[PDB]
Design a protein around this ligand. Sequence first.
Ligand SMILES: [Mg+2]
Ligand SMILES: [Zn+2]
Lengths: 251, 54, 288, 66, 1316
Amino acid sequence: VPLDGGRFATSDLNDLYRRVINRNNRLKRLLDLAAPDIIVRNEKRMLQEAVDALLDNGRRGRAITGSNKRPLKSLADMIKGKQGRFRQNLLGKRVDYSGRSVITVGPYLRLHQCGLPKKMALELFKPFIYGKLELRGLATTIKAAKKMVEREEAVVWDILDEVIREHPVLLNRAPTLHRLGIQAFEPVLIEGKAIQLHPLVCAAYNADFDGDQMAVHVPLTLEAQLEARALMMSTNNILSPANGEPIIVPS
Amino acid sequence: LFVEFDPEVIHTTTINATRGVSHFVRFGASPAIVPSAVIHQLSVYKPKDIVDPA
Amino acid sequence: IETPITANFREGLNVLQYFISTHGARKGLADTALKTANSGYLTRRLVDVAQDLVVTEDDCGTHEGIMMTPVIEGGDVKEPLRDRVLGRVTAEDVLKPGTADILVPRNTLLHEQWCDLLEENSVDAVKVRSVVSCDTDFGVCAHCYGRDLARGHIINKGEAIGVIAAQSIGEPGTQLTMRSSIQVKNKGSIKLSNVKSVVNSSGKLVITSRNTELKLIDEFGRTKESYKVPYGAVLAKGDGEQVAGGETVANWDPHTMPVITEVSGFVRFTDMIDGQTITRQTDELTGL
Amino acid sequence: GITKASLATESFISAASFQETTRVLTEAAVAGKRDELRGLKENVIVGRLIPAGTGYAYHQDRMRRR
Amino acid sequence: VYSYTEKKRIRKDFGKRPQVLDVPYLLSIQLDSFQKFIEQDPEGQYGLEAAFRSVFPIQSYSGNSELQYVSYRLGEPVFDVQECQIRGVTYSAPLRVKLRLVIYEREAPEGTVKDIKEQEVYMGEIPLMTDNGTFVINGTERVIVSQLHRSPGVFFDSDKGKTHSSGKVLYNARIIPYRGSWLDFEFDPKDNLFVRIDRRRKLPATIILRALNYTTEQILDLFFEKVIFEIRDNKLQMELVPERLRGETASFDIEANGKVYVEKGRRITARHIRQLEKDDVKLIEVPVEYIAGKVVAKDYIDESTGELICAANMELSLDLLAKLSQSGHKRIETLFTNDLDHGPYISETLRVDPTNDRLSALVEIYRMMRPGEPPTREAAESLFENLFFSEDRYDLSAVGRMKFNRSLLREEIEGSGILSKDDIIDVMKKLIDIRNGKGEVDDIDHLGNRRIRSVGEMAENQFRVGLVRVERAVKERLSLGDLDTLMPQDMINAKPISAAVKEFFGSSQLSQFMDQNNPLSEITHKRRISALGPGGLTRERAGFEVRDVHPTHYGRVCPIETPEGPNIGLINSLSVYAQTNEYGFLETPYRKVTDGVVTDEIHYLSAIEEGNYVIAQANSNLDEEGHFVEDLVTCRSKGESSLFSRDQVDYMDVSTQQVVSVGASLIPFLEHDDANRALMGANMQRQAVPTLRADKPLVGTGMERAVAVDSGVTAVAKRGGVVQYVDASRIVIKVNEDEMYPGEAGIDIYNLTKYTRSNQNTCINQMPCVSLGEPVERGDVLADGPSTDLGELALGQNMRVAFMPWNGYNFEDSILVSERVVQEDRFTTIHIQELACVSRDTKLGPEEITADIPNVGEAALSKLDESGIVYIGAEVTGGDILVGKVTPKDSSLRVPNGVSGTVIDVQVFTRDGVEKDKRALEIEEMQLKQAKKDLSEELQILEAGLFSRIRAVLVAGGVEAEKLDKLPRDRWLELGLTDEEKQNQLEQLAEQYDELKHEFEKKLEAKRRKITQGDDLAPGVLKIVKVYLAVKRRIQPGDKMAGRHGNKGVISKINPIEDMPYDENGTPVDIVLNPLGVPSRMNIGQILETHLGMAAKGIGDKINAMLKQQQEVAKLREFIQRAYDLGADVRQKVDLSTFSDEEVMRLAENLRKGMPIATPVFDGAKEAEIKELLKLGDLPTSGQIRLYDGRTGEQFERPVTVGYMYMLKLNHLVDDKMHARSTGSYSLVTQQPLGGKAQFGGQRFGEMEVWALEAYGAAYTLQEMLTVKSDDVNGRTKMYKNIVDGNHQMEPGMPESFNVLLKEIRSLGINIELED
DNA sequence: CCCTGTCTGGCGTCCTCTCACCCCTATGATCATGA
DNA sequence: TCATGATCATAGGCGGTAGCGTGCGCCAGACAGGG
Ligand SMILES: [Mg+2]
Ligand SMILES: [Zn+2]
């Protein structure tokens, strides 16, 4: 990675491989020009310890470091634990077509719908709007449609009301504890910059309104819209899966 | 590098402040008593070449 | 602290009372922090041990299930039969005590009408099919699970119940905490279980067992009181009898282990040589 | 216990996505152990349908065509 | 009497306890510690002189050379603070040191050096502290925070219960040096005694007692008493003192004097001890079985054979008695090894020892330190003398020696910094005494064992580490060169010293970035007692007890102000009156209650002196003399509260505000809030934001003026006098003559700090609040700062609140606000963003900043000038061009997408050599013109003051009334006047004037040099353009507002004016809260604050009514006097009969928007006083007005509570959190979207959400949620084509990060594949 | 070989936001000035 | 014309003639100590 300062603060792996190749080339040269009897041994010990620093740093006695106290990262520190490929990149991923803001009340909602801003609904639902523009014939190519929805002209709000209409979104509170923590709503466009969320539903999220933040996701494909309508809709989950108590208790 | 000195009375950390110090030939925890094969039975050499490595 | 806070929030609190309140409040906040730190890891380990168990058949085809009885600590009945045998398929078909008359068939989901018909006839113990005693290879059949919780009908073929189970256990982990005789209340028949009893000279019934459990059978069949009875305890009553409320029927000594006998005869010493086996320690200030 | 019952599986990807990855991968390396994706979390790893909901019908179709 | 800014608006003050010690200067920890650090300090310690006298003289490796120390000196900084923050340099001062080199001769190191050389040398740059208490490290104002750590000295801890699983407690005795090797004595379940050094391997403890050259006979002489057996004619008689026999059952019949004392089978009673010591029994008779296990003390040798009869510390048998009996010994010395009294811990320890003399012990210690190497007696002596017994590698401080003498019950608190033999022997004696059952262990969290480091001591330690590295360089170079030819600047180099101190002030765990968005946040971030950092504990490891308030935090560390979350109780905040002791502990004031009378002398107690005495509580009633009016008074004796008598008390608290900190003493009615809600209220009061026009608190605590003046945001007058010229830029004070120097004529100029960027992107403004011609006193505010008003502290604004449920829009915690609030522009905060653009140096050539730019037209370039940089004043949108930049390819700086603003300030920095373009020359001419005008006005204004002094002197003594202004004004000296003090004073003013002339010449030349020069910059950058956008963010649904008690809330709907509940006067309420947050979240103080705020506004409305009708000053005087008396025995006692009919009109001009009321913390306004003040206004007594509705126009039943609450806007806004992403950039190593908001990123669909979608039957939603939408690149391009063509369908593929997992597992020796 | 102590390996919540920081010192070579 | 001094540019892994580390805690299973 460049740090935009003329220098490369390198990753730890290139440092480790560079140490192994330095020590290995010096050992090839020392086996070339003959080792002094009981001498071709210290260099092989150094090579073994450099490879043991590369494959799993810190498992052998005291680990190495580049700067300054922190031990640098080997391969087994990229597979294991947190900050590794199993728990940070493969089981939970960062996801396109998503957004997040601060929640609020708005009690004029039916319980299968939530308020969602015009700016968030215009930025989540971009390629739907592109498809409706070149399907109705208001832009020739994709670039004219992109510049139309960047300027936000007076026709794309009608396009946006024609793409929101029967299309669920997934609302998500950030500590998801049980399976009612992800639910699916049908959006209503709001002038403003917050997510208006039905009050009874906030019994299931354990969410007050003292600064809580919720994240919305969009189901792209068709089967995911049917799963966010038949399986995950806010009217269906009125009973908890822990017991038979209703979860729509008026608070 | 081959150096002649005496271990106990002159303790090493005093002499540490200088070069000549990475550490002993060991093959083990203790500083291994090295042979001087070149000094004893292999004095004059390098007929390998003067390849001037690479 | 032996000097309590005699001031409420409508009036003032002076400095020391507010300081003692601060002791309590910061102890609570640190409990909530490290409590969340353990609770999240408990949910992780449970959803990673279950992780895989999918309702993959529709009938295993066994009979052996677990026995659901209402729990009895020794006071009021805490969890009744309706709230335990709600919606789970019966193991052996329940026969009412009009024996050889079937009340429910042996594969009937016990929803709310059937639970009320269980409560009316005062059914003892509806033996019921549990997940742990199933027979499906690589998964769990549908009938041994029960009702689809969060819905009304039986469980659908497929819903991953290990994950919803592990979340339902670990999700209230945020709410949890981190850091002489037998007195009766109700009235009914008297039951004893695992007892070796004998008759004393006083005419009562004394016990020669630690494993004795006393029970209070009520008027319609079930049990409303249970008491672990110690070793060598002395009952004022017997088995199958009838008592009244507020009547302590048993007494013992929790300090002394009684070595009471069965037959009536003299006492001698066998393999008891003085100086080695038994020592001479005279009780000085009493005499005996 | 549940951490030992989850580390002792016939599927090394589940026991690798749980606790210590070094011991699980070395034991499965010298044993030549062969996962067959066996349930939910390995299919979440590899990027295909869960065999729980709609993917359960898909997996019955896929296993029936085997 | 009152100061003149206290006659502007005198705050009404309830409160009953008459104060005796005012609030000290709140920034005294930082300033006093760093003044202790850098100052010319004689007599050795403390300061930099301690380091320079402990690491010097550097003496060489026997080369007879020596580099000794003379003195040091810091020159002036090249850059003052403002130029340093603008440009970006450190605010440092060069540290010149005078070092001396001496070189001894041969055969006489006690002989004469042949040559010396003393000279000045440059080393390091230590950063100075500004007057606010902060550092400027790289243009960013940073604070070093005090650390709370363990006090050096002995410490007797007890590892209770947990070890060995049998309840047998251990006891360890950690000696904690200030610098050096640790030392832990401990036990084990076999009751042996084990030493260890720096947590290394374990040895039996007496191996170090042989290392101090003790023979074993002397060791048993120290650690045990003696028992004497005399062989006198019958059965080897015994000397017996019966105190050892207290409860022991004898094995025989003890008789003496022909009298049976003790029977066999019984124990010796205390009265039998009295009998034996009353009859003075000395020699008793023992059997042959009594000395069957007695342990001998010293060695007995047989005189004939020359052999050893029995070794030391050995039990005696029959044959050993038979050997020593026939050798000629009549005295036998043994030891007393009881079960309860004295265990044989030393004896079992010596039986585990293999060693036998000093040499073997030193060999074993040298072997446990450095494993596996040949020891030598010289090396073992050198190591064990350099562990504990050398001035170099081991040093307790004075704090360490005080605790080490105090915890061992010594007398002198002075000693050496090194240990000795008596010290370790007393540690082992006290450890054995604690094991025996007498004496107590020491807890950890007790604040007599927690020292407070600060900026000075930590900077001294880092500077000392730099000096030991440089002595590790000077010892290398000094004896390996030719002498005499070098000077002591060729040897010592400034790289490790400057690197060490620059790394500490630059990036440490305690040198942290100042949270600066509020005067309160500054003055409570500088007062912070952090437990973390180097030498302390860590957050994710420990623990339970350290996160808990100990009983001795009372008046030292605040109990209620601490951050909730992962570190509660570790980021403690220091209290109000809490100073720091001489050693580093905490101390707090008290009042010495002599036997009857509370004497008004203050008297500072530490944390361990508080425990012995008995302290009365702060609010105890006393009748005008000090006599306690009760006969039972609530006190606290030894960490435990109780009820004591009237005149057994020894101290009383000073004021009732001293348990709390300055964060949580601005909360009115603190005693009514539950402690959780007071914690959240203090933390959110720290997190406020400055509004546009900050008002005042109607209900304060009187602590606002200390927090405002004692911080550094207001412009406090230095010398009082008369204002001469007020302006929005500057303020000129003319100094009064009874405060004024004779020379340097003197009228002061305050250059205010106008609109500039803070650290939290707020707008740190200063507004002048004085009129012209106005008198000001010494110690008084002239210019209000951010969130100040007339010298008070106004964080948020005070608004009309009602507690009622209003149609669901305030459901959980939400807040509902009228449009009357946003129309008045009263929360409209002003933010400033800094946007930088560098001109780097790459290949194909350098870059271009000029406006000849491809791919753009008129519509972009109309807002730029002819040289690329945007104008000053051009109001831009989100996504225009500010700086046009093209590389050898458009890379112009743009406004980031979303923010508006107005460009207020443009800086251009040029690396020297590069051609300045036309706008950089425009800024250079501009700043030349500004600095030229400013220094010329300095000369003109000070010359005007000097000529006014000349006119003031020439009033008498040869006065010329007409002849004074006929001649030009620069010659007012040669007029008719003899040799007096006046011609002397005119000569001194001529000296001052010519000094100002030549000083103005040289300073204008230096300022032209500073403007004209280039600046040292990054490697390979041409010029840096910085542009300051100034956004004005108003309010909207989604911002966070909160009061001062923990009542948070997202504002949920900005209603119109008409819908608000109004009352039967006509006025709409501004904010409708929710009542249901009160009984659960027990913050009942906000309702008393609401009622008292309504009382304050009722008095303000009556003043507005009595003034709007143009009434004469008599009725205003009447009503203001009635509103200022109004209470019990209070402290205020003002009278308006000494305000003289013009100040009363101006005081009423300041009271007409409400009357400010002080309510101190625990001595506040009771309920009856609020009722009596609500009766003075014509408001209802219960505080509740009946309110109509705005929609229906019909009355709400059951009348509701209205009043004024002082609510704060927090800077968790909603157009800083809101974010959305369709398709942006993707990361490089794993093809997943980036993280964050500045990077246009997507929200993390974490692991528990994957579990929650497995928990439903949603399978396709999860498949596209982790294959199509996230990772698979061909899958997502197929998806994007399919979405813009209307075909909702996914082609799945594989995650690319799983292929990364395959490459990382495959890059090991592991062969992972994909079968079939 | 049968305990029983020690040792060293594992593990210790989620999501988001902000900020700084990310070699300096020494040696060698070249150029300029002075003798 | 030659030599010396000063300034600028380019180049690597405790810094030193030792010693720094020291405020988590539980569980568990193997390795070994004692008997
Ligand atoms: Mg909340
Ligand atoms: Zn089954």
